[PDB]
């Protein structure tokens, strides 16, 4: 159709458990295609298709550069990850629940993604459909759980205690 | 108000 | 292949352009240019990277130009010079934006002066050694003085029968200035060249003391009586006693 | 920020010391560099994390104790000279290298034999100038600067094959005799008798 | 305890639009964003701001590189181009929706490649101006994709609301209606 260029890449910081284990992986794009890695777990360029090859050969063969990566783990990923210690990590917003004629569920406006849903007396193991997690994209989650059959209890990082219906 | 840290692009070449 | 920095240094009037030349490693498109001063505090001017300009300061975005044309020397310019640009000039290069390692050039000491009338070459003398020194030690010195020259922008070698020696020599650690109460004083350079007394005495050896003054270039306009006091060589000689 | 010490350092041949770099923040890997007399930096190390050794030379990096150090063991006159670290931020949004306030590292020459004497020369194109040269004297020794006289500064020479360095200074404008006055001169100094 | 976490730098050039972007994000959220026409540095919730800084600057210099290697790539291709991917869109509210009660309407534009796309509000039939949010074009695990745009509504049972998306995949402005 309409010819277009991209030159695209991502810089991944992966924390695994906070600072405990970090692996710094670096992705190259061109188009569509992704053709060159740097994970910190092999210290090295890989292509990941031939368009890639050229430029892990250049790389490669720059030892100081392949030096300086491997320390990003510590210069970049370490050192940001205690910055957003202090507030993206730690970042609580409680949800809010609303139930209306299935049965609906409404959980919405929480932070983090981590949330428990289920629903007399036993939690109906069945007849279940859900919207999944939903990302509004403004740092906020809603979802809806649905129940099939003609009380739901909410868990959350931010709650002590569980909410109900 | 802690500064970030980032990667500079590598040069291809 | 080194990096490649001229002139060596640089004398300019307020008002002139001083210009700069730097050829990189082959091989590397990233080029940085600092300034460092007396006290050795260093402030970094312009960053590039091939052809392209990627991060300057205030100051040179308004008063400098600078290029690195692709297989061609870099370049740095003050377009109206201030005494405030006096400075050692370095260029560096590195193989990749992502990645610290810088090699500098030798530099360009630039000094700006409110204009050049004073600026004059250095007379050169060499002075034989003295007898006792070869009675008492066996061994013969020969010193070497420059005088009378502005600024204290100068290299100076000794030549033996036509090749450079660096061996038995020693210079000054710099220029001392003739009157230190004169804003400009003229400046006095001594070295020492110390050989066997035998080689001394054999009359078939050469020894030369050579001094690369920097001056003004045919660039600089010159509208006084005396001489052009340029970039030029003044050297002095002297044989063997037997 | 990049805090270097010692701000100074005189080193007798053949002894060792170390310099320091202090980061307030996080660096993306160190440069250590010499400024040499004639002032061209030589690049001594570049390090991203651990030691590194290069002839009498080691350093070590730490980015997250956020130092660098530099050892110079056994020096030697060639050594003389300014050191600087130099360091780029992990934040710093210019890609340029900061540097530490530099050491002034003097080594001194060893004499081991002192012959402490002021000879005088005669220009070789005529019989009309003079200087007077004060020379192989040792390192205790150092060299003053009334106004129709000069006298340069102390400066140390090496016959690299013959094995022999030799210290000297020259006065010229008057008599070598009191050209380098007793202010300091050792006691046997030989004045020769022209 | 356990803090699996994920931080992004995501940076393009696109030709031959001539478009540059340099953000970070965290677990898929966006932290922030460089203007790099304006060099400065877009918090993208306020409170940020006061925990964190970042030297816009940098980002200006790696998009520079990145257009610089762009360059470098093409020329290793011999100039081949690559299909479009078209955008998924979706519309949803943010919140449920109750009628007389103010609320932000998402259209979810998602998979899609390049990163360049026209996105109009359409309240009852006609373009809207006014209430309307962009969000820079955001990463995903592969190497599409995703954006999101929000309108502030008022729920009624009379306005009915459109997005209208064109991207060069489609072959022509997909629409995705909603009515309360
Ligand atoms: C075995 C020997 O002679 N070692 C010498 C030592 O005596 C002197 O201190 C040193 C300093 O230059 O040179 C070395
Ligand atoms: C799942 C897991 O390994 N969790 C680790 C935990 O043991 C530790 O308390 C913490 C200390 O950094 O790192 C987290
Ligand atoms: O051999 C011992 C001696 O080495 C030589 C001297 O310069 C001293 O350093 C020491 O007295
Ligand atoms: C090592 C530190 O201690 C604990 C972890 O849960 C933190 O997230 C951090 O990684
Ligand atoms: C470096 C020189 O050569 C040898 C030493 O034993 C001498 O004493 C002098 O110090």
Redesign the interface.
């Known amino acids: 159709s309409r010819p277009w260029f991209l030159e695209y890449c991502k810089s991944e910081c992966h924390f695994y458990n906070g600072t405990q284990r970090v692996r710094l992986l670096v992705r190259y794009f061109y188009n569509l295609e992704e053709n060159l890695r740097f994970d910190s777990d092999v210290g090295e360029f890989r292509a990941v298709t031939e368009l890639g090859r050229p430029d892990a050969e250049n790389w490669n063969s720059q030892p100081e550069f392949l030096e300086q990566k491997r320390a990003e783990v510590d210069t970049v990923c370490r050192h940001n990850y205690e910055i957003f210690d202090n507030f993206l990590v730690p970042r609580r917003v409680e949800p809010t629940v609303t139930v209306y004629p299935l049965l609906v569920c409404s959980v919405s406006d929480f932070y983090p993604g981590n949330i428990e849903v289920r629903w007399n007396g036993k939690e109906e193991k069945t007849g279940i459909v859900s919207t999944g997690l939903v990302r509004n994209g403004d740092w906020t989650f809603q979802t809806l759980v649905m129940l099939e059959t003609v009380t739901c209890q909410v868990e959350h990082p931010s709650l002590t205690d569980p909410v109900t219906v | 108000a802690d500064l970030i840290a980032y990667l500079k692009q590598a040069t291809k070449g | 292949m080194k990096v490649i920095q001229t002139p060596r240094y640089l004398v300019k009037g307020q008002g002139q352009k001083a210009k700069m030349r730097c050829i990189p490693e082959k091989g590397h498109?990233?080029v940085?240019w600092?300034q460092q001063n007396k006290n050795?505090?260093?402030k970094?001017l312009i960053?590039f990277?091939?052809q392209?300009v990627?991060?300057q300061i205030d100051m040179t975005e308004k008063r400098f130009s600078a290029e690195c044309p692709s297989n061609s020397p870099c370049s740095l310019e003050i377009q109206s010079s201030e005494a405030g640009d006096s400075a050692?000039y370095?260029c560096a290069s590195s193989?990749?934006?992502?990645?610290?390692?810088?090699?500098?050039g030798?530099?360009t000491?630039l000094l700006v002066l409110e204009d050049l009338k004073n600026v004059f070459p250095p007379e050169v003398?060499?002075?034989?050694?003295?007898?006792?020194?070869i009675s008492?030690?066996q061994?013969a010195?020969?010193?070497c003085?420059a005088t009378g020259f502005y600024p204290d922008h100068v290299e100076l070698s000794w030549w033996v029968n036509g090749k450079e020696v660096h061996?038995?020599?020693?210079?000054?650690?710099?220029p001392?200035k003739?009157?230190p109460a004169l804003n400009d004083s003229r400046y006095?350079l001594?070295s020492?060249?110390?050989?066997?007394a035998t080689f001394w005495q054999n009359p078939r050896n050469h020894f030369r003391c050579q001094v690369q003054f920097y001056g003004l270039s045919e660039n600089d306009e010159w509208t006084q009586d005396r001489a052009k006091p340029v970039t030029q060589i003044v050297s002095?000689?002297?044989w063997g006693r037997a | 920020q990049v805090e270097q010490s010692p701000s100074a350092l005189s080193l007798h041949e053949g002894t060792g010391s170390a310099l320091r770099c202090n980061f307030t923040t996080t660096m993306r890997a160190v440069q250590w560099f010499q400024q040499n007399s004639r002032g061209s930096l030589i690049n001594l190390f570049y390090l991203a994390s651990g030691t590194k050794e290069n002839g009498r030379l080691k350093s070590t990096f730490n980015s997250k104790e956020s130092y660098s150090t530099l050892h110079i063991r056994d020096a030697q006159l060639e050594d003389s000279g300014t050191y600087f670290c130099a360091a780029l931020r992990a934040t710093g949004g210019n890609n340029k290298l900061t540097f530490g306030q530099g050491t002034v590292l003097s080594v001194i020459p060893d004499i081991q034999n002192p012959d402490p004497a002021v000879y005088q020369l005669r220009d070789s194109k005529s019989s009309d100038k003079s200087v007077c040269l004060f020379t192989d004297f040792d390192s205790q020794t150092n060299v003053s600067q009334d106004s129709d006289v000069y006298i340069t500064d102390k400066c140390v020479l090496d016959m690299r094959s013959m094995d022999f360095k030799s210290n000297s200074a020259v006065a010229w404008s008057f008599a070598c005799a009191n050209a380098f006055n007793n202010s300091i001169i050792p006691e046997d100094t030989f004045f020769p008798s022209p | 305890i356990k803090e699996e976490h994920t931080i992004i730098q995501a940076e393009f050039y696109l030709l031959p639009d001539k478009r540059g972007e340099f953000m970070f994000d965290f677990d898929g959220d966006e932290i922030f964003h460089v203007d790099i026409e304006k060099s400065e540095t877009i918090w993208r919730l306020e409170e940020f701001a006061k925990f964190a800084s970042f030297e816009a600057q940098g980002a200006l210099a790696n998009i520079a590189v990145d257009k610089a290697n762009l360059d470098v790539m093409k020329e290793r291709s011999n100039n081949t181009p690559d299909a479009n991917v078209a955008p998924e869109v979706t519309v949803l509210s943010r919140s449920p929706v109750n009628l007389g009660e103010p609320n932000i309407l998402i259209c979810f534009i998602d998979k899609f490649s390049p990163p360049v796309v026209n996105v109009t509000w359409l309240r009852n039939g006609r373009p809207v101006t006014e209430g309307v949010s962009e969000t820079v074009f955001l990463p995903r695990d592969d190497h599409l994709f995703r954006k999101f745009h929000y309108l502030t509504f008022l729920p009624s049972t009379d306005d009915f609301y459109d997005c209208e998306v064109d991207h060069w995949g489609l072959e022509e402005p997909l629409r995705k209606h909603w009515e309360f």
């Open positions: 498109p990233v940085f600092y050795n505090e260093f970094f960053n990277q091939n392209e990627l991060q050692l370095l193989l990749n934006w992502s990645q610290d390692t810088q090699y500098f030798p530099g000491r003398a060499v002075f034989e050694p003295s007898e006792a020194e008492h030690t061994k010195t020969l010193v003085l061996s038995g020599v020693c210079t000054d650690p710099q001392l003739e009157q006095a001594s020492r060249l110390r050989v066997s002095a000689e002297a």
